[PDB]
Amino acid sequence: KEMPQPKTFGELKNLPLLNTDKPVQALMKIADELGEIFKFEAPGRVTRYLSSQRLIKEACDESRFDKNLSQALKFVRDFAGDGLFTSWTHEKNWKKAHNILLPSFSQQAMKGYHAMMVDIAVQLVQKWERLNADEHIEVPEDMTRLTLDTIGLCGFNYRFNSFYRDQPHPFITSMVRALDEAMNKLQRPAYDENKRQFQEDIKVMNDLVDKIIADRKASGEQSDDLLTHMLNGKDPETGEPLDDENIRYQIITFLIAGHETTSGLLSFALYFLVKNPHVLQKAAEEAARVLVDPVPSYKQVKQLKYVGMVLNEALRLWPTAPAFSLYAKEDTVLGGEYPLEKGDELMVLIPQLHRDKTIWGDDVEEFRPERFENPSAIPQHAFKPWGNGQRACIGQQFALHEATLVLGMMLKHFDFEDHTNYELDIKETLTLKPEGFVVKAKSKKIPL
Template sequence: MDTTGIPHRPGRLPVIGDLIGANPRTPLQHTLRIGKRLGPIFTRKIFGIEIVFAGGVDLVTQLNDETKFGKHVGLGVEGLRAVAGDGLFTAHTNEPNWRLAHDILQPAFSADAMRRYHPVMLEVAHELTEAWDRAAGPVDVAADMTRLTLETIGRAGFGYRFGSFERAEPHPFVTAMIRALRFAQLQNVKLPFVRRTFAGSPAQNRADIATMTNLVDEVIEARRREGGESRDLLGLMLTEGHPMTGERLDPVNIRNQAITFVVAGHETTSGALSFALYYLTRHPELLAKARAEVDAVWGEREPEFGDVARLRYMRRVLDEAMRLWPTAPGYAREAREDVVLGGKYPMRKGDWVIVPLPLVHRDPAVWTDPETFDPDRFEPAAVRKRPAQAYKPFGTGERACIGRQFALHEAVLALGLVLRRYDFEADPGYELKIVESLTLKPSGFTVHPRVRDHAATTAAAT
């Protein structure tokens, strides 16, 4: 792409470019600081690679036009192909398995499918509250939300129990996954000692990928032996063909899709829940409002499937948390033809731009007082007044997240249950620290959950 006229940070150096001051552990947060100073479009250059970032809503609206742009698989996402191959997230759009898997798996996220998943989500959410009931002190919110969402996707999607709340340490799959994601993220760092320090060795990465694939292969093989007519994700992949052609997924792609859904299906949702609880504990008046909605809508009964969508304020809380910190923090768009971005910046077919969502979600041309946590931004009237492309936490176009409804149902249900059950004592001195891998999560954020009086009475009565 012709970057003439696109601003960059002052002090760019030969060879290393804009590396000074960058932290390999937090590249996104460094990019955000730069973008706030430089405006809606800017570049960063590291070791000869110049990357264009667009964080202005007007530019992103053009980039999200599916007739002129599509998903670009590059940088960290390209590195993830070693883990997930041509799974839905890492596949190039022109790879045949992307469309095939997308069409086969759409029924797994229909309204009927969501009704089937609801009891599983409820079961796992109760395991979380049972663990918090037993807690004698503060709990690590991100760690426990990861247990919740991993267990949910494992059981709902694949009929597999990770035993997340029965373990003192994370499941080996999670440990291997975290290292593999970090390794992929840092593959574009040209200094080998930096990669080894922060991401481990290639040998360790191969071992981590083997840990993940071996587990998935065992789950798939067990399902093949059992047979049956399950309509979960794994059942559809093993038994269904394309609705038009009848073509089936091959065994390697089934493995790739399984890894993709286990990783993406829990990492993003756990982050959204963690950020939402963080902001609620920092705004007691908003927490009280969300809890009052749960008490009024659900009362003390077990929430049924249709009750979850009735928590409209709770949904706005999650939307606002994902506005500030979208846990899948960006995507890249590639020109399908020669275009001029924003009427000023020529792009040839194949050129690409990264869209860092925390900048889009803070564009001062659209968002008033953008750093403030305010769920009322997502009242229906406010949403209608905003540009459609101003909020994209699940990506855009045909490559947007297929599991969006799964994630939102699970998150609203879980957050509703914990707010109904607990008062939270949070460390007032904690300052938000964000850890980056494929996704974003709060690091070191703990709360001490205390069962509310009415919740304790209800539990004793049952």
């Protein structure tokens, strides 16, 4: 009846218990002590963290709870605007863009992005093929190079050329610095340079994207990217198209929502494979059996079943956008025991949900891809790395097609060594990633 809550320390409330730069991991330990639900207060706010499948199934009821824009999302909204990720469900542009963009993110639509994803995936393989004997790979760095370039090419036919550079394209440098500033604002005279840089970074981003939109309208070119689709699509509901300003925000939004979530997933998957050589072997065996052509076809990517299972299991242990926020649309009672008032906030703690022992068995820390051999049997709302319902990840199919393709090619072309015996260090920002994860690859010398 009364909601569990950690010890409060006078006016600091529960704040002294989260003195870390890894709040999700610390929250997971509080959940281990207090259970499926706890309230957490700090001087400014009140939130409630949910961890069990039984209560998350209720939180995922869209007639009762809707997506809440957390303080992180409101800060990201300063450059992501009313793009899909940082808009409220009730905003007109949320619904218009959702309806217009769904068909361009479907599984069927991946067939059209496939050649551009293969283009960047070949650049990564060649990079690693061309390393001399004494070098090594920086995993999350290379994966981020890949996902940024893939989203840029597939999103608006623009090449950041990240594998040609030490220093990223100026757009990228400004987007990542703006994102970093947005997240750093959470924990805050001498912030005047921060502010001016943020405004400069926003201007860099808007100018380039507005310029690419204007160039495309002026040429009439039609391409296999999302920009063509947004320029020509009309919302079936209102009959209206997106305006140019919103199309820019969607472009920025695809990059910010997709770049690190997807690179983190590839990095965590490669981490789990090198730490479990028998799993790596089974995945590599499938890659060799399936990828018989010089470059993978769309159909071959879809037959990489075990590779997909490895990605799902990496997502189960370390979902790379680890928490999403919801608000009660109306007064309601959660689980028959906890009364909530209209507007009360809930946080879904995804990694902890994914460790619910009543669903997955007592062995939740083990890396076992076989858990996903029959997806249809997993209980409803037990596995939620893509968020929920109409506010779920629109990029799901794109992220999985990209990651499946890339990991399959990695496993086909190289043998991997965890030459430093890397100790997992999970950095938390908007996303999760195995910071400093490094490997050596040994070419299998299989021609592209």
